Amino acid sequence: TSGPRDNNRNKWAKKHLKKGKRAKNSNFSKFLKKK
Amino acid sequence: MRVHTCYFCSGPVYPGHGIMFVRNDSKVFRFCRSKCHKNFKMKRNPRKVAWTKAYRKAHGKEMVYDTALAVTAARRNVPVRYDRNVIATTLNAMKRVSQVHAKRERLFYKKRLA
Amino acid sequence: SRGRGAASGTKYRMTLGLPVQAIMNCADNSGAKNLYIVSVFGTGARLNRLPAASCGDMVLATVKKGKPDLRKKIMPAIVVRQRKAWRRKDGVYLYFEDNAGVIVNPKGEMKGSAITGPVAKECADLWPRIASNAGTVV
Amino acid sequence: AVFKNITPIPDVNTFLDVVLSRTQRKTPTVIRSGFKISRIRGFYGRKVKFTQDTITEKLDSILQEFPKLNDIHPFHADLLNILYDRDHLKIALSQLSTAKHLVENVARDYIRLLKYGDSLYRCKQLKRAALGRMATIIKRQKSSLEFLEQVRQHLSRLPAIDPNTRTLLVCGYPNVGKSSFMNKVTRAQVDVQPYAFTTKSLFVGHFDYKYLRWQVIDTPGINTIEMQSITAMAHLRSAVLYFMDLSEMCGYSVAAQVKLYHSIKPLFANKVTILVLNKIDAELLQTIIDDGNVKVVQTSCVQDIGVMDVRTTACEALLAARARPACIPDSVKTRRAYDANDPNRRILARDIEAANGGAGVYNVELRDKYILQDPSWKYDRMPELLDGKNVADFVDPEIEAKLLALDEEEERLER
Amino acid sequence: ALRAQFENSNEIGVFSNLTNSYALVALGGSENFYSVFEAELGDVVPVVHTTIGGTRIIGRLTCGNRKGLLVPSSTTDNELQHLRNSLPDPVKIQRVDERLSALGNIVACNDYVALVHPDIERETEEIIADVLDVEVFRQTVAGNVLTGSYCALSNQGALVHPRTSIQEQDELSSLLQVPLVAGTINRGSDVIGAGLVVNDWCAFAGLDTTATELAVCESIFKLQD
Amino acid sequence: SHCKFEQPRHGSLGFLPRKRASRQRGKVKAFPKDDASKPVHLTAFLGYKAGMTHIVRDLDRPGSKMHKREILEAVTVIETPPMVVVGVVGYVETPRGLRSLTTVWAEHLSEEVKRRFYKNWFKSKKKAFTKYAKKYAESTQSINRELERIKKYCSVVRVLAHTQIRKTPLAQKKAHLMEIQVNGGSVADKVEWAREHFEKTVDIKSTFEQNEMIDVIGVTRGKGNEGTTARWGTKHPANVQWTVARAGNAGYMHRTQLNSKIYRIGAGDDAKNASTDFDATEKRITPMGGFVRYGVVENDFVMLNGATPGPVKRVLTLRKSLLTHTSRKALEPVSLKWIDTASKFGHGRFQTPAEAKQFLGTLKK
Amino acid sequence: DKWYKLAKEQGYRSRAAFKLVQLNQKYSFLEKAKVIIDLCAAPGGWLQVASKTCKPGSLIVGVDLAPIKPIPNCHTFVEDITSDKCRSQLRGYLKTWKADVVLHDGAPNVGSAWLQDAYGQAQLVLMSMKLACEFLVAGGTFVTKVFRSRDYNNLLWVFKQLFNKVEATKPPSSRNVSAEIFVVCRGYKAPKKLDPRFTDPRTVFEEVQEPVTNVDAKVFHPEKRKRSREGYADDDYTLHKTVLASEFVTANDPIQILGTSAEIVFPKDDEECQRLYNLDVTTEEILLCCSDLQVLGKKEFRDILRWRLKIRDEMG
RNA sequence: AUGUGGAACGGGGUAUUGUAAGCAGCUGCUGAGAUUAAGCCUUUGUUCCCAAGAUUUG
RNA sequence: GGAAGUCGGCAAAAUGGGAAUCGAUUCCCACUGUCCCUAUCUACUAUCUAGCGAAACCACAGCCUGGGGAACGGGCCAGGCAAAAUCAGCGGGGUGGCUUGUGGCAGCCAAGCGCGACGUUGCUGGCUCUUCCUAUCAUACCGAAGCAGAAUUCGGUAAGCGUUGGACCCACUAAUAGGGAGCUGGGUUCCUACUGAUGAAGUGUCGUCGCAAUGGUAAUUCAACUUAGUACGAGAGGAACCGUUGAUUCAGAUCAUUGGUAUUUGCGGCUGCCUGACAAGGCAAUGCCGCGGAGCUAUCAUCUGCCGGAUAACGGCUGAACGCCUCUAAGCCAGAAUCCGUGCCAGAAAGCGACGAUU
């Protein structure tokens, strides 16, 4: 099985970070940031 | 999520605490701590071990019955449909058990003192 | 393919208490009495580590005492009971008072028909056939 | 008999290169003259032995994967007869086995002489003398290895037959509608072309009917193809499906087809033939009809009419030769079956899933379907424990009444 | 008669239980199984995505009919509360303090008659008759004690082992007042209960069930109309 | 000659030297990457390991073997009283690294942070920051100049914050002072945020929010000098190389546990912090009889999954994860069902004395 | 080893050849054996010794699965050791004669459970004597190798009924570290017909049940978990077996009942058990003790035993 | 280096064991008694002690 | 769990014993830290201190790499390097640029200079251990093949990471690939290194908070759910990518729960001993037994193990050389578990910055 150094695994991990899967962290940061 | 009752001391058994033992007759025993588990291994009768609630209630050292509030507790094998009004006033009945049982707990020991 | 053959679900890590050379009770009505552990499936490359099995693991078993025609096959066996205490993922610690197992084919349906004694739910979940033919599942 | 599992045979050069490369790569390579003579002898002995082991390992793989013509069902044995000349195939396989034994003999001989090697050189040439003889042995079966590879390639193409199961052999004149009948009956995509004898070899196709599966084997029309067709019906518990061109639109005369069927009747015996009138839409036949076993079913090949009836008749002939009130809900009587394409079809949790992230991401709400006096509380958390007691032991629809009765009682005790 | 697979397993009786008033499916795996059940019974009876004791063998752990449902001792309070909330009011649920926890293996019960493991407890038999409202009979199937796993029951038909004799066939039919056929499910597997779940108007079997077997179940269960 | 029977290396070469950490406080060797798209927010906090317990939570993990079941997990309780911001440090990027250009301190420094500057507070004349306080009172235009310098030249803004160790039931009186990098916004925005946060307390309620994934860093427990057996896991003419396992220090090393989940951030002023929606039963996070060797938790606390490095009453640093990692374990919510507060000093059997008193009879005392 | 060196020097193909010749020297059987059939002939050392020692022109047969190197006067049969075809060739070569001595050298592959290997050839020797007793003449001899195990006594028992004399021994060339024994079964009984009990191995290796288990020791010592690995009471579906109270009182095996039964019940339906229930001698402590037999101590068992004796005094 | 100061004891809580001696009449006092930080928690409790000696430092 | 350890029941536990063969061997039962797999407890030593106080050994000493014809060595050559004084451990240090994958005899050619190359034809030692190499068994990615699918064969880059448990045998495993540079059996009759621990010293002094040159580096494999009974296939059979869940091995932590440990000698019980007696306690080289907090600990318990560039095999774009073509010559794109960083550990005790006070 491909490891974590895999360039593919890095690529779709980047794809996850490119979409709303990290938008739950943006608004999460904004909540404390505003309060 | 059930706070079971130990087989040996008859005390509460919370999650994580204690041991579960399954016998070949599919009977399940729950032990709250290592003291009760090892005592069960040596097969010491709870009715003849002093520090057990089973001994205390079977030796006259604890109340014969407490029909507190016309109903105190049972192992209900028929589930009941969830209601708020039922769930809130039974939350209150919980407490009303506690003071009444606490009151009778004071009265019984005061009687046993003399 | 025997390794996780017809498991219908992953197993959680469980305390290992039945290594190889273990002698353990047959639990089915097929006629076998005692089993001897020869090897366990799914053991990797660990130096000096003795291969071991838990509840619901599939092992290679030899019927030491039992019916002669039941013997002379290194038959797959499912460990259904274990004396060593193990942590169920919900938190409770469990241990049956004897080490028991069933004679099964590599596919995952046993030669027996009814299980005498308690059956671990981990065993009954990785092996629906044992669950189907179990009498009491705990 | 799935002949596809035979490993591919390298030509003599690649075989030698693979063997020698494996010997070089897997065995140690460096030795010095100053080493103890025992280590020198062991060094070259390993290479000779390792090369022997690689060669037999490959040669045995061939000898085991090929089917033993004697031990197999005589349908396939005779089919391999007409296609491959069992004697040539048997000679080719025996040559490899004789080679295998020769490779073993040379290696045993040279390992034996190596025990007496006195210098790094005299061992070096026994090893060179060894491997060369091993190689020259292999180079002599160039024809046998090439022949077996060709046989292998065509073997992997043959259909997987099973005479044990119920069958219905279809044979007749070339392009006489038998291919059309096979295509209409079975899912097999048999090519139909104006060129005669388009079906060079046999074509096996399964068909489900009468709660059973029958393997219809279409044979070449009637040469090597004709011989293979004859052997196909030679050993098979099946019925003949002869198709005679009623209108002669297939290019074959009806009288000629009848004469051919009468001549082939000796091999078609013990079977329920069919007197198919092919190309119905597009005298001599009296003698064929006099047999009785042949079923005269019209086959309008141009209009594709009667093919299903003929197939059903043939299948039937082959089979012959071989208080509890169930209160079903009213909605069940008018329930529309869930078929995806229709718009009236309701939704399923499977479709909610693909919309809401698919497998592993969508969290199914277990609580979403509770029969409950409200849809809002539908996500509430019911208290389970309170002050050492479960809330569950006390959930009673009249529990308020027990509490008021009680009130009165405590008010009595305080007084 | 339909063909379905839970995950990639031919045993759907183990992972689901079906009655004439409700359906129960395993939780936590693929809901494709729940999706298939809803496709045929969603508009007829409720389908409950439930587990019993944090376990997916609910089919062989719980036995029930169109009237009542039974759960073993290992059933958690939360799951029991979940089942009560999901199922409609006219259906009653009961915990059983039975040594033989596998209710689905020891009890094979239709709407009117149930045949039980021979060594069942008297208190279990009494509460079964009270809740299920069926006549209970202690007998073995083909000399085999697991009646629920080795026999499938419906209102109009039932199946048993092919190993049973003709006189055992007649006796079982006479004691059950329902047509009974000796057969097999999932291509030669003699666990009829594990491979088949049947209500009074539809049948589910594993995808590996042969066409001949499906015809047999359809013939005995009269489901063509 | 080759090794006959091979095994993987008995140790890890990435954690040596196995020497004693040159620090007692967990160092942040990496702060999360900055971004001007997001304005101001902190990135770290400092707490004390009070003790650890176990909880029961309903696991909503789609696709899991135990989806929608009750699970038991060990949890670590770290008391996190609010920390006072007393300084700001500007860092300028140079071809030689990040260099601290200047530092600005708040006017009023508590004795808590003043004790950090002395090895003996009582003998000292307490002269630290006195002239700084004088110049702060006299002329604020000077301090405005360093802040102008920070917002004009510096690229990284960090705030010096010290923990109110007085609030914790610790025998230590020195406050732990560290730098938390202000991530987000322009350098001017960070400088302003530091200014309006001078002398005020920043709490864990504003730093972390009960669901995110953090890195917990600290110094591990000390096991003393140990032989090759327990230090390393041990069962041609040359000189001994560094790779050979040897006998030496085992324990008290700086470690970093990644991917720790906060199950709960509770408030000290609230008396329901140990109670959940499935439990009621008014109680506090402190177990019956107090935490073993720590005391009673009376301030804001954080409950992490698993175990964290170091023994009780040791200081831990909690930082935001450097890299986003959207594993569904890191993205799922947590709904606590029950928290264990029985006596950890022995085989405890009761959650609170209130509910112990009904079961037990009337004690003579 | 030394015997391997002797074999390679002299020409014999195995140390087992030296084992055979030493056995022939001490027992003096093969020299008079006109018809010798050797099963599992590999590697052929037995055949070489037999051909050399015996008078040329005898009926020497060697049957094995591997290619048997043609041994002089030894018809070599490369087939299964008990194939229908191979038995046909044995009969075809036997003709009017009958088997006099059947040599056997069954050696299955080792590398599995020791019980498997020992029991594995045990049927292979058992099967080989089946074909032997098919082919033997009256007074014949059957010689082979067996590893000792729990089935070794049973195999020798079957040998005792099927042959007049048994002379099992171990030669010096045999590796004493291993557990092999050379059994020599001479004086063939020559029965009227081969008994189905002997032929069919269900009745041969059937486990002979032993006397009652030492359960009173466990009764007297409820502690000391002794790792019970025997089985489950010969197909006992429910392990919560209960014993009638009146039956236990009237029984003559109280220790066995306590050691086997898990509970003693006092049914209300039975009038005698109800009378025992209402008896003043039966107390609540005894009632709870007998309600859970397995969780009971030495004192409780002794109290129960005294109680049953007191009831025995009362009823008669 | 006079402080929400420290220390020695004491109380309470929490734990370990199992119901003490004695008074008595197995039972009651008595889930009592004993131990409890030596690397458990707490203290409006009492008592006591510290605003000292030496050394190196531009 | 019960000899799975070892050449082997060496030694302990069963109290040593039951049956066979010749005291030995074997077998079945029995027992157990030999082992999986180590953990805990006690005493002594080692540690420090007061006093006393040696000996062996000693040309001088003390870092490594390549070379010094040899004998390479420590002194010589060329490099890496190199900062006082020390402490406790452990014992390391006291002969071809060879070689590898393709045998021997004869003839026919014949590029060419009597030979004559390739061809072509004729015949019979094992138990544990650090690191390195690739000449790759598995894992990653590619090309070819009747390669439909699945499974597979060969070949290329590739040494990052694994390559077991038992008596050549039989299992597991993804695989059980090949080699280089403390110990025991049958067979012949000081100093230096390594590992931890202090430590004087510029920078005025003492501190607090930091920076980061450099050195080390870590994660590995499997199967489970859909995607599927779909692509493909007459059928038999039947995958993949995205997403998700567990487990094997390894690594780093932790002690809520569970087990273990008992000098808490904490409590209780039993035997014997000690004052006339009711009692009262105390004693027995840790008298014996049960429980036993705290601590320690267990893949016997729980937790945690991540992303950016540059490439190799290889697939392409434009495009000449060579008016065509061309992945290459100038340039460009995609591309492997690979290399380099990030992250993680250490922090130059002769690298540094900011701040505080300053007798």
Short mmCIF file of N, CA and C in Angstrom, two decimals, chain G residues 247-312:
data_model
loop_
_atom_site.label_atom_id
_atom_site.label_comp_id
_atom_site.label_asym_id
_atom_site.label_seq_id
_atom_site.Cartn_x
_atom_site.Cartn_y
_atom_site.Cartn_z
N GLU G 247 -34.85 -36.35 44.27
CA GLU G 247 -33.94 -37.34 43.69
C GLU G 247 -32.56 -37.24 44.32
N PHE G 248 -32.08 -36.01 44.54
CA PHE G 248 -30.78 -35.83 45.18
C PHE G 248 -30.78 -36.38 46.61
N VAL G 249 -31.86 -36.15 47.35
CA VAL G 249 -31.95 -36.66 48.71
C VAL G 249 -31.92 -38.18 48.72
N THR G 250 -32.67 -38.81 47.81
CA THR G 250 -32.74 -40.27 47.75
C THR G 250 -31.57 -40.89 47.00
N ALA G 251 -30.72 -40.10 46.35
CA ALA G 251 -29.62 -40.64 45.58
C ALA G 251 -28.50 -41.14 46.49
N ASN G 252 -27.66 -42.01 45.93
CA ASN G 252 -26.52 -42.56 46.64
C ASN G 252 -25.20 -41.98 46.16
N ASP G 253 -25.23 -40.94 45.33
CA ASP G 253 -24.02 -40.30 44.81
C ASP G 253 -24.12 -38.79 45.00
N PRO G 254 -24.10 -38.32 46.25
CA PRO G 254 -24.20 -36.86 46.47
C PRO G 254 -23.00 -36.09 45.95
N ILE G 255 -21.80 -36.65 46.09
CA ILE G 255 -20.60 -35.96 45.62
C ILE G 255 -20.63 -35.80 44.11
N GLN G 256 -21.04 -36.85 43.39
CA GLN G 256 -21.13 -36.77 41.94
C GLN G 256 -22.19 -35.76 41.50
N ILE G 257 -23.34 -35.75 42.18
CA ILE G 257 -24.41 -34.83 41.81
C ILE G 257 -23.97 -33.38 42.01
N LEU G 258 -23.32 -33.10 43.15
CA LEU G 258 -22.83 -31.75 43.40
C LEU G 258 -21.76 -31.35 42.39
N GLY G 259 -20.87 -32.28 42.05
CA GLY G 259 -19.79 -31.98 41.12
C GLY G 259 -20.23 -31.83 39.68
N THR G 260 -21.36 -32.41 39.31
CA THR G 260 -21.86 -32.33 37.94
C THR G 260 -22.97 -31.30 37.77
N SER G 261 -24.01 -31.37 38.60
CA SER G 261 -25.13 -30.45 38.48
C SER G 261 -24.72 -29.04 38.90
N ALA G 262 -25.31 -28.05 38.23
CA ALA G 262 -25.06 -26.65 38.54
C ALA G 262 -26.12 -26.03 39.43
N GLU G 263 -27.19 -26.76 39.75
CA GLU G 263 -28.27 -26.19 40.54
C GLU G 263 -29.18 -27.32 41.01
N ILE G 264 -29.65 -27.23 42.25
CA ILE G 264 -30.63 -28.16 42.81
C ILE G 264 -31.91 -27.38 43.06
N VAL G 265 -32.97 -27.75 42.36
CA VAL G 265 -34.23 -27.02 42.38
C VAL G 265 -35.24 -27.78 43.23
N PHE G 266 -36.14 -27.03 43.86
CA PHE G 266 -37.23 -27.59 44.64
C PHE G 266 -38.55 -27.24 43.95
N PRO G 267 -38.93 -27.98 42.91
CA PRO G 267 -40.12 -27.60 42.13
C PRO G 267 -41.38 -27.60 42.98
N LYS G 268 -42.25 -26.62 42.72
CA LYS G 268 -43.53 -26.55 43.42
C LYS G 268 -44.50 -27.62 42.94
N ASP G 269 -44.39 -28.02 41.66
CA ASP G 269 -45.30 -29.02 41.11
C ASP G 269 -45.14 -30.36 41.81
N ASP G 270 -43.90 -30.76 42.09
CA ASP G 270 -43.65 -32.03 42.76
C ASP G 270 -44.02 -31.91 44.24
N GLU G 271 -44.89 -32.80 44.70
CA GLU G 271 -45.35 -32.73 46.09
C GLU G 271 -44.23 -33.04 47.07
N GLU G 272 -43.35 -33.99 46.72
CA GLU G 272 -42.23 -34.31 47.61
C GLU G 272 -41.26 -33.14 47.73
N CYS G 273 -40.95 -32.48 46.61
CA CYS G 273 -40.05 -31.34 46.65
C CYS G 273 -40.67 -30.17 47.40
N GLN G 274 -41.99 -29.99 47.26
CA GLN G 274 -42.67 -28.96 48.04
C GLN G 274 -42.62 -29.27 49.53
N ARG G 275 -42.76 -30.55 49.89
CA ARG G 275 -42.62 -30.95 51.29
C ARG G 275 -41.22 -30.65 51.80
N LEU G 276 -40.20 -30.95 51.00
CA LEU G 276 -38.84 -30.58 51.35
C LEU G 276 -38.69 -29.07 51.47
N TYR G 277 -39.38 -28.32 50.60
CA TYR G 277 -39.35 -26.87 50.68
C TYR G 277 -39.94 -26.38 52.00
N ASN G 278 -41.05 -26.98 52.43
CA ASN G 278 -41.72 -26.57 53.66
C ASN G 278 -41.10 -27.16 54.92
N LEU G 279 -40.15 -28.08 54.79
CA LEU G 279 -39.53 -28.67 55.97
C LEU G 279 -38.74 -27.62 56.74
N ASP G 280 -38.83 -27.68 58.07
CA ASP G 280 -38.11 -26.73 58.91
C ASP G 280 -36.61 -26.94 58.81
N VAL G 281 -36.17 -28.17 58.55
CA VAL G 281 -34.74 -28.45 58.42
C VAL G 281 -34.14 -27.64 57.29
N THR G 282 -34.87 -27.50 56.18
CA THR G 282 -34.42 -26.69 55.06
C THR G 282 -34.57 -25.22 55.43
N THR G 283 -33.45 -24.51 55.54
CA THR G 283 -33.44 -23.10 55.90
C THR G 283 -33.23 -22.23 54.67
N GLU G 284 -33.37 -20.92 54.87
CA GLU G 284 -33.19 -19.98 53.76
C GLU G 284 -31.75 -19.98 53.27
N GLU G 285 -30.78 -20.09 54.18
CA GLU G 285 -29.38 -20.14 53.76
C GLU G 285 -29.10 -21.36 52.90
N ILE G 286 -29.63 -22.52 53.30
CA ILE G 286 -29.48 -23.72 52.48
C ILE G 286 -30.21 -23.55 51.15
N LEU G 287 -31.36 -22.88 51.17
CA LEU G 287 -32.12 -22.66 49.95
C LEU G 287 -31.31 -21.83 48.95
N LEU G 288 -30.71 -20.73 49.42
CA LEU G 288 -29.90 -19.91 48.53
C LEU G 288 -28.62 -20.63 48.11
N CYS G 289 -28.09 -21.51 48.97
CA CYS G 289 -26.92 -22.28 48.60
C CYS G 289 -27.23 -23.24 47.45
N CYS G 290 -28.32 -24.00 47.58
CA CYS G 290 -28.67 -24.95 46.53
C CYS G 290 -29.20 -24.26 45.28
N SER G 291 -29.62 -23.00 45.39
CA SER G 291 -30.07 -22.27 44.20
C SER G 291 -28.92 -21.95 43.27
N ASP G 292 -27.70 -21.83 43.80
CA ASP G 292 -26.50 -21.56 43.02
C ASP G 292 -25.42 -22.52 43.50
N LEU G 293 -25.36 -23.71 42.89
CA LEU G 293 -24.42 -24.73 43.34
C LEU G 293 -22.98 -24.37 43.02
N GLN G 294 -22.73 -23.83 41.83
CA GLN G 294 -21.36 -23.63 41.38
C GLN G 294 -20.64 -22.58 42.22
N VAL G 295 -21.34 -21.52 42.61
CA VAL G 295 -20.76 -20.51 43.52
C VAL G 295 -21.09 -20.98 44.94
N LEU G 296 -20.26 -21.88 45.45
CA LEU G 296 -20.41 -22.39 46.81
C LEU G 296 -19.04 -22.81 47.32
N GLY G 297 -18.85 -22.69 48.63
CA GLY G 297 -17.59 -23.02 49.26
C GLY G 297 -17.59 -24.42 49.87
N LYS G 298 -16.44 -24.76 50.47
CA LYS G 298 -16.30 -26.05 51.13
C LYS G 298 -17.27 -26.18 52.30
N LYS G 299 -17.44 -25.11 53.08
CA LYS G 299 -18.37 -25.14 54.20
C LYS G 299 -19.81 -25.35 53.73
N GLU G 300 -20.20 -24.67 52.65
CA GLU G 300 -21.56 -24.80 52.15
C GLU G 300 -21.84 -26.20 51.62
N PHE G 301 -20.88 -26.80 50.90
CA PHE G 301 -21.05 -28.18 50.45
C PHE G 301 -21.17 -29.14 51.62
N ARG G 302 -20.34 -28.96 52.65
CA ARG G 302 -20.44 -29.81 53.83
C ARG G 302 -21.78 -29.62 54.53
N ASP G 303 -22.27 -28.38 54.59
CA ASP G 303 -23.58 -28.14 55.19
C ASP G 303 -24.68 -28.81 54.38
N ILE G 304 -24.59 -28.76 53.05
CA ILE G 304 -25.57 -29.43 52.21
C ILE G 304 -25.52 -30.94 52.43
N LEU G 305 -24.31 -31.50 52.51
CA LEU G 305 -24.17 -32.93 52.73
C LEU G 305 -24.75 -33.34 54.08
N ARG G 306 -24.51 -32.54 55.12
CA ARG G 306 -25.13 -32.81 56.41
C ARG G 306 -26.65 -32.68 56.33
N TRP G 307 -27.14 -31.70 55.57
CA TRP G 307 -28.58 -31.50 55.45
C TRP G 307 -29.26 -32.70 54.80
N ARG G 308 -28.66 -33.24 53.73
CA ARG G 308 -29.28 -34.37 53.05
C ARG G 308 -29.27 -35.62 53.93
N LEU G 309 -28.23 -35.79 54.75
CA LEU G 309 -28.21 -36.90 55.69
C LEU G 309 -29.30 -36.76 56.75
N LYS G 310 -29.51 -35.53 57.24
CA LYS G 310 -30.58 -35.30 58.21
C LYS G 310 -31.94 -35.60 57.61
N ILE G 311 -32.15 -35.24 56.35
CA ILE G 311 -33.39 -35.60 55.67
C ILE G 311 -33.48 -37.11 55.50
N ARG G 312 -32.36 -37.76 55.21
CA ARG G 312 -32.35 -39.22 55.10
C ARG G 312 -32.72 -39.87 56.42
#
